[PDB]
Amino acid sequence: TFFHPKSREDILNEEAKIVQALNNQRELTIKMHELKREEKDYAHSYSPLFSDPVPQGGSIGKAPGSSRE
Amino acid sequence: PREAAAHWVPFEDKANMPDNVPDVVEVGATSAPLLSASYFIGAKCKPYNDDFMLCREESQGSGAIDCLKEGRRVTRCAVSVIEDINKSCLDEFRLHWQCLEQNNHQLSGCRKAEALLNKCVFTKLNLEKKIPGLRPDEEPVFLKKDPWIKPAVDDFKSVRAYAEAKKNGTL
Numbered sequence: 001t002f003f004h005p006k007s008r009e010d011i012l013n014e015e016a017k018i019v020q021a022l023n024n025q026r027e028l029t030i031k032m033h034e035l036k037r038e039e040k041d042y043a044h045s046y047s048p049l050f051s052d053p054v055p056q057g058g059s060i061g062k063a064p065g066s067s068r069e
Numbered sequence: 070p071r072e073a074a075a076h077w078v079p080f081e082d083k084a085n086m087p088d089n090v091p092d093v094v095e096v097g098a099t100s101a102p103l104l105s106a107s108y109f110i111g112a113k114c115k116p117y118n119d120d121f122m123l124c125r126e127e128s129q130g131s132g133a134i135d136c137l138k139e140g141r142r143v144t145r146c147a148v149s150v151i152e153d154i155n156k157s158c159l160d161e162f163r164l165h166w167q168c169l170e171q172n173n174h175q176l177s178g179c180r181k182a183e184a185l186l187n188k189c190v191f192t193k194l195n196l197e198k199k200i201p202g203l204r205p206d207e208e209p210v211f212l213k214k215d216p217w218i219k220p221a222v223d224d225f226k227s228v229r230a231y232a233e234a235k236k237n238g239t240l
Binding site (some may be wrong): 067 | 130
């Protein structure tokens with residue numbers, strides 16, 4: 001009469017919920033690992049404003065024809 | 070391009086133009102006559118110079134070989150205007166460029182000869198000297214009277230000719 005354990009079904013349900021949270025963490029973990037290895041845009045990784053990688057050099061003796069795309 | 074360094078020899082190429090390229094006359098005036106005639110050359114040949122430079126830009130690196138044609142056009146326009154000066158206003162042109170030869174090529178030292186040359190060229194060739202980019206408030210320096218900066222010696226022949234023109238009323 002003094003033994004009041006939880007029901008077997010409740011134990012299984014609770015452990016299944018815990019394992020589901022654990023698998024969610026495993027998936028988020030693998031996800032972040034993949035996303036860190038993907039490559040970012042030039043604006044996000046180098047410069048948001050002035051997002052053109054192409055330089056323009058010096059402007060004193062600007063020679064017609066020096067521009068090359 | 071940088072100037073040459075420790076040891077260099079100048080060398081001359083004896084080949085001719087490839088015969089496919091149309092021949093062109095070359096400008097024969099030297100530094101002082103060229104600097105004297107520069108404003109008129111610009112006023113006359115501005116469209117051709119602009120076209121030449123636009124070709125050189127658009128070629129994007131092959132400018133020398135793709136832009137020969139309007140280069141010939143540019144040189145021809147320049148030779149034409151120099152010939153017109155030699156036919157119509159030779160004496161004043163010589164005054165101006167000899168004065169420049171004497172004054173380290175500074176236009177500030179030849180205002181008197183330049184006034185005569187400018188009047189002659191405007192009347193006989195319909196070319197005007199003008200300095201681009203100034204607002205109406207700003208005054209072209211070559212039109213300014215009583216400048217702060219004056220030549221060491223006013224050129225003798227130019228002074229005589231200027232006083233003569235003031236008498237004749239041409240200037």
